[PDB]
């Protein structure tokens, strides 16, 4: 008995086709994903194979103007139009609270929504009763398949589920729901969930009776072959786990942003044992046409969003240079503008202790994803800005020893010239690099804006002194190779969403004109 599992995860509100870098679509022929194209590929597989399930493993909520304006009404409408068979709750499904999960998603979705490890209590227990499920018995042809869902234990930190939900251990909560399906004479069982690849592997290993694991949260690309785009696989598709009972359990994920359709074909025997499994995420590129009905519907919802996305937030009278040839090689005015925004946002005074808690800002050149042109009568829109910052990182507050920041600035240029993203733009820092020195020894001047002073002025960094810095969450977690930051910092406090910070700054200043002014120099 043969099943075809189609799966998406972490689509993150990418309802329209994107660029290859999952931002806004400029050249039609180089564009990818979107529900209209996903509909085309799904219809075609459903016309070719008898036993097809379309599963989502959470994080449909949050990512574009779509989610901000329609608040998950768009998720219900366009997942309903695609006849998804089941969805597991992600952490971002709680971003507008359990209230904002119920009101559009759980009430308008025609498909089952699953989490075996989220328990409801208080007056929410009656209000949410039956709207999400521990497990689902799905008829597929003349057989049944059980689904059990699971959601990251960490959702109560990562999002806003409130006090009336309990996120219990996935393994402990999953096992009794799998046992229940076995007592209902269900011999084929899929764990569909949103805790990441490391947890997906442990579920496959430890939960007796799970045949297959379909996953999200870690944006993990698994591919068997020469990769068709820029995503480097963490391993082969599917990833086989030997369970403690000696079973081979396929584990799958499909990256993020609706760029790939996961595709897994399983042969089961009569008793529900997995005999064989093969597949590969399908790259959804311009060689699959957008379905014309879904596209016309997308266009309909688009009309009310065009107001919102071409909303003037402020004016620039300069070219905002966030091009990679500038921001990965030298000081760029886009970098200066984002760091000046970051410092403007984090304003706390104390009379005899400091002018500001924070004077200092770093940002990896790689994070800045677009320029903005000033010729559109100087207008900066949300869309324009979305293109610079497509990915909803937060700007966080860290404490670092001088020596740690010295090491970060060494890493910034350790392989200078090769268009890598680790090259730092700055505020409240003057740095000089000598590129003719050996890597680890190219920082010849590092001056920082004091805080323990009434008049802000520049002093040479001290190795044994502690500084407060605003930097992207990405750098805080050691992205682009900044392990010295992740491993050596002393405090981390999580801040506001990148685009929100840059947006309020532009709207408060009304007219910006950031210059390149010598924060970064070369001998």
């Amino acid at each position: 008995w043969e099943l075809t599992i189609l799966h998406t995860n972490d689509v993150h509100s990418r309802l329209e086709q994107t660029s290859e870098d999952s931002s806004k679509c400029v050249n039609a022929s180089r564009c990818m994903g979107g529900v209209a194209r996903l509909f085309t590929k799904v219809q075609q597989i459903r016309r070719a194979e008898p036993n097809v399930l379309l599963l989502d493993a959470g994080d449909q909520y949050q990512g574009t103007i779509w989610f901000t304006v329609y608040k998950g009404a768009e998720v219900a409408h366009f997942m309903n139009a695609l006849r998804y068979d089941a969805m597991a709750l992600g952490n971002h499904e709680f971003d507008n609270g359990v209230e904002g999960l119920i009101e559009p998603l759980l009430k308008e979705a025609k498909f089952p929504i699953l989490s075996a490890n989220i328990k409801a209590k208080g007056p929410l227990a009656s209000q949410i009763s039956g709207l999400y499920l521990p497990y689902k018995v799905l008829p597929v042809g003349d057989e049944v398949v059980g689904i059990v869902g699971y959601t990251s234990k960490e959702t109560p930190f990562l999002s806003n589920p409130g006090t009336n939900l309990v996120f219990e251990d996935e393994i402990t909560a999953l096992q009794p729901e799998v046992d229940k399906l076995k007592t209902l004479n269900v011999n084929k069982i899929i764990a569909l969930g949103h805790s990441g690849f490391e947890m997906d592997k442990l579920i496959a290993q430890k939960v007796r009776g799970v045949d297959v694991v379909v996953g999200g949260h870690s944006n993990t690309f698994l591919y068997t072959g020469n990769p068709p785009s820029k995503e480097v696989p963490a391993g082969k598709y599917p990833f086989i786990v030997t369970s403690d009972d000696g079973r081979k359990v396929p584990v799958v994920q499909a990256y993020a942003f609706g760029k790939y359709l996961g595709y897994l074909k399983i042969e089961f025997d009569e008793r529900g044992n997995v005999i064989s499994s093969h597949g590969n995420p399908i790259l959804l590129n311009s060689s699959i046409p957008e379905d014309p009905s879904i596209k016309a519907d997308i266009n309909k919802w688009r009309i009310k969003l065009d107001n919102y996305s071409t909303q003037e937030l402020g004016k620039t009278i300069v070219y905002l240079d966030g091009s990679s040839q500038s921001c990965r090689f030298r000081e760029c005015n886009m970098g200066n503008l984002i760091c000046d925004a970051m410092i403007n946002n984090n304003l706390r005074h104390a009379d005899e202790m400091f002018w500001n808690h924070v004077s200092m800002c770093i940002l990896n050149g790689g994070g800045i994803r677009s320029p903005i042109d000033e010729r559109n009568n100087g207008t900066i829109t949300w869309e324009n800005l979305a293109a610079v910052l497509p990915f909803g990182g937060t700007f966080d507050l860290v404490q670092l020893k001088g020596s740690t920041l010295k090491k970060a600035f060494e890493h910034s240029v350790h392989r200078y010239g090769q268009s890598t993203g680790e090259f730092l733009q700055v505020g409240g820092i003057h740095v000089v690099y000598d590129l003719s020195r050996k890597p680890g020894d190219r920082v010849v001047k590092l001056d920082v804006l004091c805080t323990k002073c009434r008049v802000p002025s520049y002093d040479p960094l001290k190795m044994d002194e502690v500084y407060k810095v605003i930097l992207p969450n990405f750098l805080a977690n050691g992205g682009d190779g900044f392990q010295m930051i992740k491993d050596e910092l002393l405090r981390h406090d999580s801040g506001d969403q990148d685009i929100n910070v840059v947006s309020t700054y532009i709207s408060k200043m009304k007219v910006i004109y950031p210059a390149v002014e010598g924060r970064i120099k070369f001998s």
Partner: antibody, heavy 118, light 108 residues
Framework: EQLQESGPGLVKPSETLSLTCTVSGGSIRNNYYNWIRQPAGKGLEWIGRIYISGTTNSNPSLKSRVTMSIDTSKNQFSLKLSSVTAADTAIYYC?????????????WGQGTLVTVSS | EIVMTQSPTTLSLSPGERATLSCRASQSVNTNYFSWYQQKPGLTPRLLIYGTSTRATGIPARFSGSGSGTDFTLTISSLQPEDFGIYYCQQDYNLPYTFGQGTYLEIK
């Protein structure tokens, strides 16, 4: 309806800490049970929660140092805090959610003052 | 974590006047998860308001809880001597739970 915390008033730097909140009004219901602390003079700081079933979340500021426990045949909930420091001297409160809303902190204990010093 | 900036730090008004305390959250808080505490420097803090707006048992009608999104307000309309001490706003929408710096209210 009342919550008293058991656990001593004196701690060494680099050392343990057993605090045991006892409910005896009625019993541990289907609710989150909290620990909070306050540095003397300054403001309130949330430590962690535990549901009946044993599930626990704690403050990421303290994350590595907190363990918590619950027992319904006993009828209370414990706290443990590893590796203590000057900035940890503070009054330690147990508390539970308002039983209509399943929100807020309603029926607090007396508290216990703890001190780090040798 | 959601930062709770209460203002002012210290009010001094006369009995019979109106104390309007203001709490500003760095992120939007669903009104089901916003609450107000009274504390007398020393002893157990007592719940005033849960939801943004609901009085707890034993709390008089003087106390009007208000607000939504980012901006929450605690109005006390006719102040009396025993209304001395510290007042904290609280959110349990996101972990950690977080309390404000506190607002210090002396009767003139």
């Amino acid at each position: 309806e009342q919550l008293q915390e058991s656990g001593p008033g004196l701690v060494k730097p680099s050392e343990t800490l057993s605090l045991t909140c006892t409910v005896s009004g009625g019993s541990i219901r289907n609710n989150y049970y909290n620990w909070i602390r306050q540095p003397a003079g300054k403001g309130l700081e949330w430590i962690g929660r535990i549901y009946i079933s044993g599930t626990t979340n704690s403050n990421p500021s303290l994350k590595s140092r907190v363990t918590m426990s619950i027992d319904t045949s006993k009828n209370q909930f414990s706290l443990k805090l590893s590796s203590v420091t000057a900035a940890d001297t503070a009054i330690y409160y147990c508390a539970r959610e308002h039983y209509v809303s399943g929100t807020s902190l309603d029926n607090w204990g007396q508290g216990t003052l703890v001190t780090v010093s040798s | 974590e959601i930062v709770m900036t209460q203002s002012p730090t210290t009010l001094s008004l006369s009995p019979g006047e109106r104390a309007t305390l203001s709490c500003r959250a760095s992120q939007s808080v669903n009104t089901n998860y916003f609450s107000w505490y009274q504390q007398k420097p020393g002893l157990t803090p007592r719940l005033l308001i849960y939801g943004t707006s609901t009085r707890a048992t034993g709390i008089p009608a003087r106390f009007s809880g208000s607000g939504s999104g980012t901006d929450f307000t605690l109005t006390i309309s006719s102040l009396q001597p025993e209304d001395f001490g510290i007042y904290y706003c609280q959110q349990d929408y996101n972990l950690p739970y977080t309390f404000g710096q506190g607002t210090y209210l002396e009767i003139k």
